[PDB]
């Protein structure tokens, strides 16, 4: 009936000032604003939900237009609740400042 994932923002890639490393993404999870509070979300699965033109098969039932690139919150970033997530396919940078879902279900509570 309700939402079973937390709001994250694909803010950027793991980048220096003049070099970006696309294989590691930076996830701004809404709610957590320090490394104090980042402890829960480490090792959690995080999905980039997008929809395209051509239909693709879905695990559960009928083929939708909606797709994902799956991920995994690797470890905490910076000092302000930013987190590093490493995706199985390196995210497209059209998704910069768009909604990707930090899930709950590599649960350890």
């Amino acid at each position: 009936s309700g939402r079973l994932w937390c709001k994250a923002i694909f803010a950027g890639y793991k980048r220096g000032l003049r070099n970006q490393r696309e294989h590691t993404a930076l996830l701004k999870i809404e709610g957590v604003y320090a490394r104090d509070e980042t402890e829960f979300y480490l090792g959690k699965r995080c999905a980039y939900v997008y929809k395209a033109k051509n239909n693709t098969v879905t695990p559960g039932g009928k083929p939708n237009k909606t797709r994902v690139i799956w991920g995994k919150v690797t470890r905490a970033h910076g000092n302000s609740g930013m987190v590093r997530a490493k995706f199985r396919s390196n995210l497209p940078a059209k998704a910069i400042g768009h909604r990707i879902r930090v899930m709950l279900y590599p649960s350890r509570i």
Binding site: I9, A11, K28, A93, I96, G97, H98, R99
Partner: protein, 199 residues
């Protein structure tokens, strides 16, 4: 989903530095009452700083040159514009989300306006330092519609005062009808206070 930030008392670059970053994270921001924004240091320094900005024009065709936007909304827009990569297609995707206003145009005059406390003159300046209202700056450097805005601004300062008077009037009825009904919500008040809502 939309930030409706108030501009009254906020600092020029401090609010810009926090707006510009939120908008890059795909948060639609509305900064309102930008005449209320003030800039640190005395007025005459900030006057000279913008007069120094006016003097900088493309010598061979000023119409091509730097567009010195004189409205406080567009002095706030341009200071945010400097804190965005406005050449790239992610940084122009940003500015399209930002929506800046002189006064409080509807539909934003009947929405609760948020405050950035990390960009506020009471929080960030000393009470013995000096500041410069963007209303006085813009007007004296060539903004026309301050005395237009300030009279439309004085309409809703009467209209919203009636709304608040009409809302205190309904909260007095709640501080009467929480009390008449105190005996038959007694089960429903305790469990709120065991888990710490009305304590």
């Amino acid at each position: 989903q939309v930030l409706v930030l108030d501009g009254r008392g906020h600092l020029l670059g401090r609010l810009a530095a926090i707006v510009a970053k939120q908008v890059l994270l795909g948060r639609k921001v509305v900064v309102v009452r930008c005449e209320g924004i003030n800039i640190s240091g005395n007025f005459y320094r900030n006057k000279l700083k913008y007069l120094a900005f006016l003097r900088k024009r493309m010598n061979t065709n000023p119409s091509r040159g730097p567009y010195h936007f004189r409205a406080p909304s567009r002095i706030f827009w341009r200071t945010v514009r400097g804190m965005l990569p406005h050449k790239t297609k992610r940084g122009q995707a940003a500015l399209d989300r930002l929506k800046v206003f002189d006064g409080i145009p509807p539909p934003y005059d009947k929405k609760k306006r948020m405050v950035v406390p990390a960009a506020l003159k009471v929080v960030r300046l000393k009470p013995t330092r000096k500041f410069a209202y963007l209303g006085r700056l813009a007007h004296e450097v060539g903004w026309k519609y301050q005395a237009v805005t300030a009279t439309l601004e004085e309409k809703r300062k009467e209209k919203a005062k009636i709304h608040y008077r009409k809302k205190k009037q309904i909260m007095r009825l709640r501080k009467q009808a929480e009390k008449n009904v105190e005996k038959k919500i007694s089960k429903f008040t305790e469990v709120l206070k065991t888990h710490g809502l009305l304590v």
